């Protein structure tokens, strides 16, 4: 299809659209041009001073991120871990054989001269560093991120793991004392500290200071939500990554799947840089955002929901996608696995039920395929004139009729307002 004629006057029309094209940025491509991840830590002058600048800055709701970065550096500066094996990611060699390594052995520099003035400080503060303060500054990465009221559960969480060493204290206030740590996740140096700490302790999981991860843990595979839903779909179907992939029935979703599964990105690597591609500045447009794979997100979450997922209810409904086709493909898949439990005896005492002697008899059918093979189900679906069956519909109805308190623009609200009627 290229030339379109108008039937009336036989004039040629050329249908065109505005170009909206922003090519995704892969992690491996960063190391094609640069060999180091710069951590512009700037100022590094007196921990006792930085302690005072930070402590009052959080209390007064006015703290420089430069001061926070410098404090965090000096507090975690000396953390060491002895490697057993080599450590490499995307060509760049981090450590060798039996080296003793610190968290900041991922390239450090100095930059722009311009230290923010006194502002607010107090010398009264003792040596409660390694104690609670740096963990707080790492744990507010999690708190200053969520849109829904969950900060009254996350800031409250930073009290069980905070007071393992000394007393109990919380600095930022209740109402307007929240926007101060919201901005931090835009200073690329800070995000590099949180990712480094995490990556370091994901390797050295046995280290005594591995509890610093109680603040940094959500930094990992953040910005890789699409991979999570792919994983979630495997776990809820009980099928392999290969089997799930055979169940893609929409071209848009396939396009997105090929995008996510580009070779040479170290996704299945044990200790790589890729679980932090955004925070480390390796990428600015993540290939593994739900936003960059809208069709798969919808298709995946809906299928999971119809399969009793406790995550999918509140999963964001994307826009500008082929909802109708995706819905049908999702339903068919959901119904396939929901009809085919494939129960089999796992243990015996001396006698087991045998199926290899009979699986299908003469004529006794008029029922769906008992496996989960796409080919048999695609065959069955075309016999059903490619329109969902009353039973497929009642299945979906039963899957969504019991869920209450649904939010707007979610997969849950969509399914309920599509199948419960």
């Amino acid at each position: 299809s290229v030339t379109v004629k108008r039937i009336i006057d036989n004039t040629v029309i050329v249908p065109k659209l505005p170009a909206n094209e922003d090519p995704v940025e892969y992690p491996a491509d960063y190391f094609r041009k640069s060999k180091e991840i710069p951590l512009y830590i700037n100022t590094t002058k007196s921990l006792s001073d930085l302690r005072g600048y930070v402590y009052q800055g959080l209390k007064s709701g006015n703290v420089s991120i430069i001061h926070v970065n410098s404090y965090l550096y000096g507090a975690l500066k000396d953390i060491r871990g002895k490697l057993d094996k080599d450590w490499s990611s995307f060509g760049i060699n981090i450590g060798k054989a039996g080296d003793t390594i610190g968290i900041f052995d991922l390239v450090s520099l100095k930059a722009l001269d311009g230290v923010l003035p006194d502002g607010v400080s107090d010398a009264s503060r003792t040596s409660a560093d390694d104690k609670w303060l740096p963990l707080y500054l790492l744990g507010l990465y999690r708190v200053g991120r969520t849109q829904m009221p969950e900060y009254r559960k996350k800031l409250m969480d930073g009290l069980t793991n905070q007071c393992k060493m000394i007393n109990e204290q919380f600095e930022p206030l209740v109402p307007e004392g929240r926007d101060i740590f919201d901005v931090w996740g835009n200073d690329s140096n800070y995000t590099k500290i949180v990712a480094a700490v995490d990556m370091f302790f994901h390797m050295f999981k046995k280290h005594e200071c591995a509890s610093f991860r109680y603040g940094t843990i959500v930094s990992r595979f953040k910005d890789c939500a699409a991979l999570a839903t792919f994983g979630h779909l495997c776990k809820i179907t009980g099928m392999s990554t290969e089997d799930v992939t055979t169940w893609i029935l929409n071209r848009e979703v396939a396009d997105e799947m090929v995008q996510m599964m580009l070779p040479g990105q170290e996704i299945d690597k044990a200790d790589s840089y890729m679980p932090y591609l955004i925070d480390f500045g390796l990428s600015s447009k993540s290939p593994y955002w739900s936003v960059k794979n809208p069709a798969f997100h919808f298709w995946g979450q809906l299928t999971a929901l119809l399969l009793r997922s406790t995550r999918a209810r509140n999963a964001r409904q994307p826009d500008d996608i082929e909802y109708t086709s995706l819905t049908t493909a999702g339903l068919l898949y959901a119904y396939a696995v929901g009809s085919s439990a494939d129960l089999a005896q796992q243990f015996c005492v001396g006698d087991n039920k045998y199926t290899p002697d009979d699986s299908t008899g003469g004529l006794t059918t008029n029922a769906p395929p008992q496996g989960r093979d796409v080919v048999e189900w695609l065959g069955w679906f075309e016999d059903q004139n490619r329109k969902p069956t009353p039973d497929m519909m009642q299945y979906a109805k039963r899957a969504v009729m019991s869920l209450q308190g649904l939010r707007e623009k979610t997969i849950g609200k969509y399914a309920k307002s599509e199948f419960d009627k």
Partner: protein
């Protein structure tokens, strides 16, 4: 019975399983159709062969394409 092909309605056909270990489907016309009118309603003729009648007959339980990929058909 009538028409010409309806005599074979009691005699069965067998189709070889496409998968290694599966049971061959034994099927007949008098099993896919109730009487006579249904056969002529769906698009049947007497001039039809036994197979061509059976292949048209795979539409009672709506199971042609499913058999197509599962049997020698």
């Amino acid at each position: 019975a009538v028409s010409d092909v309806w005599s074979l309605s009691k005699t069965s056909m067998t189709f070889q399983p496409k998968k290694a270990s599966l049971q061959p489907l034994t099927i007949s016309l008098d099993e896919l159709f109730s009487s006579r009118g249904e056969f002529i309603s769906v698009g049947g003729n007497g001039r039809m062969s036994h197979k061509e009648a059976i292949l048209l007959g795979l539409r009672y339980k709506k199971l042609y394409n499913q058999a197509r990929v599962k049997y020698s058909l």
